[PDB]
Write an enzyme that holds these catalytic residues in place. Sequence first.
Site, mmCIF file in Angstrom:
data_model
loop_
_atom_site.group_PDB
_atom_site.id
_atom_site.type_symbol
_atom_site.label_atom_id
_atom_site.label_comp_id
_atom_site.label_asym_id
_atom_site.label_seq_id
_atom_site.Cartn_x
_atom_site.Cartn_y
_atom_site.Cartn_z
ATOM 1 C CE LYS A 86 -3.124 3.021 2.338
ATOM 2 N NZ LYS A 86 -3.422 3.680 3.662
ATOM 3 C CD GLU A 145 11.684 4.589 10.395
ATOM 4 O OE1 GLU A 145 11.938 4.796 9.173
ATOM 5 O OE2 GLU A 145 11.262 5.491 11.168
ATOM 6 C CB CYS A 169 12.268 8.960 10.185
ATOM 7 S SG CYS A 169 10.686 8.564 9.399
ATOM 8 C CB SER A 170 17.137 10.840 9.667
ATOM 9 O OG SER A 170 16.910 11.493 8.434
ATOM 10 C CD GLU A 222 8.489 11.890 13.402
ATOM 11 O OE1 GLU A 222 9.602 11.527 12.974
ATOM 12 O OE2 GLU A 222 7.459 11.175 13.343
#
Lengths: 516, 516, 516
Positions: free
Chosen positions: A207, A288, A322-323, A417
């Site tokens: 997906k 993750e 993400c980093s 985040e």
Amino acid sequence: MTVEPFRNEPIETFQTEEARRAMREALRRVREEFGRHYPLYIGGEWVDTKERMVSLNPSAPSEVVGTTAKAGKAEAEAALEAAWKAFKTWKDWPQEDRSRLLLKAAALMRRRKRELEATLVYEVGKNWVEASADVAEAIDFIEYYARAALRYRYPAVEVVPYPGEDNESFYVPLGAGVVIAPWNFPVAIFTGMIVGPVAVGNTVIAKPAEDAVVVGAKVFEIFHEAGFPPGVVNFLPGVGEEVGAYLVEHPRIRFINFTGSLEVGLKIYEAAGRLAPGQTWFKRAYVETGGKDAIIVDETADFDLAAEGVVVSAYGFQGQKCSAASRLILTQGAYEPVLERVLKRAERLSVGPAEENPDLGPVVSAEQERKVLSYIEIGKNEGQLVLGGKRLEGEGYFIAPTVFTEVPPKARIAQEEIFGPVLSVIRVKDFAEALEVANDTPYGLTGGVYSRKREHLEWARREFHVGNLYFNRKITGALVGVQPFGGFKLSGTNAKTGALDYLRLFLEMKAVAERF
Amino acid sequence: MTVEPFRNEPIETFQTEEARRAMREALRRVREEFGRHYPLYIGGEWVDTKERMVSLNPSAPSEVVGTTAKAGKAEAEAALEAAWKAFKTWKDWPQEDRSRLLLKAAALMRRRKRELEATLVYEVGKNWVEASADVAEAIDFIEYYARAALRYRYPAVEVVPYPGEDNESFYVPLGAGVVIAPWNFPVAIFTGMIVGPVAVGNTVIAKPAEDAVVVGAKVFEIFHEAGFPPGVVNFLPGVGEEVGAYLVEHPRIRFINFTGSLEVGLKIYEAAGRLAPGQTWFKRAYVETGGKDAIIVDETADFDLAAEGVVVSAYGFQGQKCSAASRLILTQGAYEPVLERVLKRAERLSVGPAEENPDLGPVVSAEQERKVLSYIEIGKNEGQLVLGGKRLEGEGYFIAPTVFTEVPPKARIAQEEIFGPVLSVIRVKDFAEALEVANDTPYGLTGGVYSRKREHLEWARREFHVGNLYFNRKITGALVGVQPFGGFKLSGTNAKTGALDYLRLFLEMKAVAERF
Amino acid sequence: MTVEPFRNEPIETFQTEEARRAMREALRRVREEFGRHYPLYIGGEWVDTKERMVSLNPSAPSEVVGTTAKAGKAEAEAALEAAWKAFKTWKDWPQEDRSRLLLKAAALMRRRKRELEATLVYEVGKNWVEASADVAEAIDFIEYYARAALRYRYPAVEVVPYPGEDNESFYVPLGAGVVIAPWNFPVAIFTGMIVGPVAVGNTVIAKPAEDAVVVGAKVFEIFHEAGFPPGVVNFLPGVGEEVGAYLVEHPRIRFINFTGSLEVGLKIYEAAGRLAPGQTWFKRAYVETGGKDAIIVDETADFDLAAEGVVVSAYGFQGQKCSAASRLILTQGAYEPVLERVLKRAERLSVGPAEENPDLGPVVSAEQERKVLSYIEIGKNEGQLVLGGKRLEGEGYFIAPTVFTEVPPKARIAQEEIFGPVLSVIRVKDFAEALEVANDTPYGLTGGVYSRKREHLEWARREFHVGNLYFNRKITGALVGVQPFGGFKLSGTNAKTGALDYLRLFLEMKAVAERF
Ligand SMILES: [Cl-]
Ligand SMILES: [Cl-]
Ligand SMILES: [Cl-]
Ligand code: NA
Ligand code: NA
Ligand code: NA
């Protein structure tokens, strides 16, 4: 199978006229095809639906970049049937044959690099080098996993012999699973998450993220041309949680490979722990789930080098990584020198339509814009706004590089985040406190330290609790093979992508003894 | 650290006078010590409680082998605090140091072999050779994991180099976790599940099975003598769900290592998938959950060899093994010759107090006896009872070797794990059908084939879907190092014990780059 | 630690405009800093003295290139205290950490290449390519020893196992030692001799050669920026034998690493063999003490290739190399053809100020000039002067490329190391006599053979008794890693620099057994 030793695909910098010409030609071809419709891909064929999904250009959201079919539960079930049917024979292909198939896909993708890059530019708002890095990483995953899979080939396990017996242990693939891919690296991570499991004999239903359905379809064109047997890889663009929920909760889904928000990751992991009615295994779920990544700078650092690394890490692809460096932790001696340099660099960054190769394109969607702006409002109540913090003019989702200072370590903007161009600057007394502040989030993905002091670096090596740590350089752009990628804590399950260990996650072991 | 290559500890057969003399003295001393009290072990000290637990002799349940302290939530919390405190420094021991500590523990256990075997005889009703195999396997886990851990030592990860940088990937241990151990191998599997995680820098809180708390305490005596630092290993005998549930659900438990019933395994895996309030990681849960294991025999087999292996596999330790042959699948040509031989062998088996070294001792508890007898009643209305099917005279929990034949493949006794001396014989037309029937259960742990036909053996190698498959020999007694042990499907998460891969489950990876 | 496989640093040829521009800029920066004063470096800090040392430009000796502090016994004692204090913790750094420190120093040195080259040009009279080769070799030593040291990491020794025991052998560093460095390669060999011992956990007090104190100080600036802990490396420029004698004879000096004249080497080796009052070890002394190196040419050689190789070997850096061709041994058939070509090439060589990139700069000092001229006078009495043999006009120490012919093999100029641009040509009958003459000196460092005859080459491989032998190429410029460098006989102790074996010299072994 003997091929050249793995090397990373070079990232195009567009410093030559030829490279610039080639990109312009690719951008033209891609936009001439904005009217294209891309069906689902199920059991080796393109399968259309009545309903459709629209993909917009975040630099000009009134402009459609393509449409796709829209999978529901019925199409998810069809794909699952096809994937299990394919698994019965795909699992028995010699590894050499499966690895050659991957190598073919990599060659095809390399030949279409500029096209895929231009699609990233228009569909998800990557500037030119961000787009090139993304496609290059996709190629890297295919090349790397093709080779890594051979390390697991029959019979790979080291066992102790026993008299009068053959004892043979070997790996077997799990079955059919679902991949839920992100919008931020919708060629690289989309590709890696599919081809890793597939390389060692699994089959996959993928997906794509809603914002990146067109470029996912183009990756599937590559898989189709490479000639993966029907059912081995399947493509199910969909709206909202329907397709993903159905598959994650399905008794006949063997594993789930997810990259995305913690909110969604937590739900997936919890669902995977449940036995669905009639389920006959313990599901594996790999998640993750992002980070709240800090760069520490101490007073011994090269402050110019630090400032440049911080700006790249914080604002590359608009902080939608993400980093990404979303926290800048400065010891007292480093505070003013580093902050001044960071502000000077950041204020010079261009923001505009991604095709113009600005320092920053737009954020990916109206919803992302809303989220980032909402965090900016929260930040005004928690820290001191010193740069940006505003939407910029135009229908595109342009947000200015943003800096908050005097941010308390436990502030929402220092803990949550944001996934946008928003850097929170935290002043600390010394390196020990810097590490304490760095560690005190729910996350553990990337981290960086700028310092010349060996003792500080080596202390951070041991004590800065992140899965990917970088010294005196940017904390984004983990390279396949070089830097196994994956985190600790609520950054996910530490499934290290671009590493030998990744493929083990998609295998189980059999031990067969014969007494002669 | 350089030591001799791993070899398995020899299993004593007690055929020499020396061995018999040594065993008789060990049994006498254990028996003379009946009624001894063993406290909890928390933070490097023995800690008593007001409440106590009683461990009975299943061969004569009026006899109290010993008592232990009983942990509740408060002691579980104390152990967790001690384990995290220890982890802070234990994780930083050089691997060579941790491995030497394991080697010492193995040496101490080897010196106490006869005592531990004798304790198994009295506490869980193992005959002499079953007791010896159990202790020998415990020693093997320690010896094996001590060496295997060195394969993971800093910095163990193979990565691709990058110009101008050091890239260093290495493993780190997870933290403090809980071990929930079984009663059936309460020295071997109790030891393995604890020392594997501990070897590589984790700390452990261990809950012994209720029926096996004394021998668990004796293993802890060995750990204490070996000098594991305070908090590294902790011993929490407890009654019912309290201790286990509290730890499994705790936000500060990092991993769960479980071996036992499917029912309990399912609850543990589901609970591990949840984020407890304040939890800051995705829990890892390893579950090994039993089997419904079959031996297939075709008409080409050595029928005498097959019958002997089936009897050993079905009735060793009263069928109380996850690996036990509980199904015998016979092709039409093998049915009469093999069944007749199995019945002739099984009807000769002795049953009595374990100290007498009978072929079968008692089942482990009154509750186990009740369950097995209940399944015998169910079996009587599903298949044809042709041997045994009753409790024998005496206070001990003695059940006769039992055989049902013409059992429907989907009968409860052909599907559900009885965990007693009850064999279900299923008649099938040919080898293809044998494999179909073999595979059609929710489990996938052990299996066997007796056949001389190469094509049948090699077919089963690929298609008989069990984690541990054996040809022309018993399907029980997997040796550490030789036969990585663990299954597929509802037999658990395929955590292969006694294999290099086991230790990887208790580690996460860090990748650290320095740009010079 | 994973870095790219070792490669040698490319030697700049200055054939591009950019390279020439860069050198001119570096020469300008260096001469603008001729007024600089450089203190001692002791215990992590620059420490000045009352007295100073002056460094002159040998191309213009009225021009000062810098001044330094001047160490005496007190400063030597301070440095020794600092080095032992540092050793107590430096010895316990993980090897990976020490190796990373070296890699950092290499990166810093690479970034300052042109600056260091320009300093060599002005301070010791190297032309441009000689200067570049010198700095490149320094970088090579750091890169190579960083990697080589990991080969010795805990526990590195291969031992035979014994039952019931762990047997573990491993290397430990020696302690604090003294490095006495040469003026001829005062970046390369200065660096190698320090960083080799330091890499594996030793600490070092370094005395630069008097003629090269400024460039030694600049190397120490690099060590300081790299962040070696205080006391690990120390810098003690000094005049005459005071500092060196004090340290060599000290009871608390653990090892001595020397490169220089045989006269001094002999004294050092003799002193090292003595037990100073209160000394508690046997001192290790490594001495590399020069050569009297010959190139043999036979009648089968490519005479043009030979002549070019001979001229490079004899006159590169004015013959001031331990490896320099100071003897040319010609078989009868080769004599006239080779000599004519050697004379023709040599007479075309330019001599002048080193910054102008002449073929030859000046010799290093007034004392060196005196020595070379004195040998020229001796040579006039022993052989026939056919080229050069004169001082050239200017205050700089310019000496013409000099050739003597008809030199008896036992003449002083055929036996004694002149260390200047003076070639002695010896006629021999055949290849066997060529080898006899080549071997008959007290030395055994470098040697060369130009020949197409396989049998002559392979015979020389066995019988030409030199540590570094080269066929059909120059005999100078040994590359780190490629050509382990060091000699036989009175050329020293055969401590092979740029080789794995070098680091073993600075380690002792411990064997630790544990009986479980
Ligand atoms: Cl860590
Ligand atoms: Cl299988
Ligand atoms: Cl030789
Ligand atoms: Na889009
Ligand atoms: Na008991
Ligand atoms: Na000088």
